[PDB]
Amino acid sequence: MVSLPRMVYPQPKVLTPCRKDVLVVTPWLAPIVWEGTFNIDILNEQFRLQNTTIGLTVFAIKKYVAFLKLFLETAEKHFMVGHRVHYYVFTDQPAAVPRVTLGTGRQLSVLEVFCERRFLSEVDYLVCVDVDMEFRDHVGVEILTPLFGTLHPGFYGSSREAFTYERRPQSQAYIPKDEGDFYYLGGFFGGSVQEVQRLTRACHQAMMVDQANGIEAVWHDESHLNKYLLRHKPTKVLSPEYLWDQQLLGWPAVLRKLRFTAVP
Numbered sequence: 001m002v003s004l005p006r007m008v009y010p011q012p013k014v015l016t017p018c019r020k021d022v023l024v025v026t027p028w029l030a031p032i033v034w035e036g037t038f039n040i041d042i043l044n045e046q047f048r049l050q051n052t053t054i055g056l057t058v059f060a061i062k063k064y065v066a067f068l069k070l071f072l073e074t075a076e077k078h079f080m081v082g083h084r085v086h087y088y089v090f091t092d093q094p095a096a097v098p099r100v101t102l103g104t105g106r107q108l109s110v111l112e113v114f115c116e117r118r119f120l121s122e123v124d125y126l127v128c129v130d131v132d133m134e135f136r137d138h139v140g141v142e143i144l145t146p147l148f149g150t151l152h153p154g155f156y157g158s159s160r161e162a163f164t165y166e167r168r169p170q171s172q173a174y175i176p177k178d179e180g181d182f183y184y185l186g187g188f189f190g191g192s193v194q195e196v197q198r199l200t201r202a203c204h205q206a207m208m209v210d211q212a213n214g215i216e217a218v219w220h221d222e223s224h225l226n227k228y229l230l231r232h233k234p235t236k237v238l239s240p241e242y243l244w245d246q247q248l249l250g251w252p253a254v255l256r257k258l259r260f261t262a263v264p
């Protein structure tokens, strides 16, 4: 909307690829976010001029409340630093949520298990992630777009036939062996509030239909997420840098950074 100010940075090289080891754009022209593909200074300017507010949602039920401290502490160090952030912690143990110190312009709401309409009036984007994780490096506005999915660290190099999609035609999450772009994680997705609510509403209805027909998708919510993103292409896809497990997968050369990881 508003003009960017004068900025001094390296000129992009038309005849020099960003990365020659990985795919950086999908066949529907959605960028695949890898380190080296974006200039964060330009993106930060663009989103700050919009006074962007990002909502980060996590569920912490039962024993999972134990992961909140590290999750929030590291998010304060690496998640959208500099931008407005609103944390939404859904838990069955409100009094168990740790008292974490937040930077200015960032807030946290504890919701005991809220109106879906509230999201529309409080944030511009919603980022939904698993709580038994920790941020280890930058996770910023480069991920913001109408709808995004993240490449599962265990299948990013696999062929579609190897993807663990739901293969039973009786399930609404059914995806045949000759279909599929990528295998997306259920633990890290997001986009505009409108698109995220459309995705979760679609998933909710599809799972209800499956339940009625007495069937449960092989990987539950994640199976439906994959069906949704197959039929509604994400406008950005995040590389495995955004959700990794160093204990189980190490640190491959293809990953210049490990940004969000599983907690042992």
Ligand SMILES: CCCCCCO[C@@H]1O[C@H](CO)[C@H](O)[C@H](N)[C@H]1O[C@@H]1O[C@@H](C)[C@@H](O)[C@@H](O)[C@@H]1O
Binding pocket: 152, 153, 154, 164, 186, 219, 222, 244, 245, 248, 249, 262
């Ligand atoms: C992080 C590397 C994990 C590779 C092992 C297979 O990971 C599982 O993949 C299926 C889909 O085929 C589901 O997505 C499971 N939820 C995955 O395992 C669980 O989540 C991954 C990220 C790991 O944290 C693993 O330890 C969990 O069991």
Ligand SMILES: O=c1ccn([C@@H]2O[C@H](COP(=O)(O)OP(=O)(O)O)[C@@H](O)[C@H]2O)c(=O)[nH]1
Binding pocket: 058, 059, 060, 061, 062, 063, 064, 129, 130, 131, 132, 187
């Ligand atoms: O009793 C439970 C089970 C799961 N979760 C949430 O569901 C996410 C996914 O579950 P889990 O960690 O068990 O799955 P994994 O990533 O190991 O496949 C977790 O990160 C939690 O945020 C929760 O809050 N309470």
Ligand SMILES: [Hg+2]
Binding pocket: 017, 018, 019, 036, 037, 038
């Ligand atoms: Hg580049």
Ligand SMILES: [Hg+2]
Binding pocket: 057, 126, 127, 128, 196
């Ligand atoms: Hg969400």
Ligand SMILES: [Hg+2]
Binding pocket: 057, 058, 059, 128, 129, 130, 186, 187
């Ligand atoms: Hg989530």
Ligand SMILES: [Hg+2]
Binding pocket: 200, 203, 204, 207, 221, 224
């Ligand atoms: Hg669902």
Ligand SMILES: [Hg+2]
Binding pocket: 199, 200, 203, 204, 221, 222, 224, 225
């Ligand atoms: Hg879903």
Ligand SMILES: [Mn+2]
Binding pocket: 130, 131, 132, 187
């Ligand atoms: Mn998890």
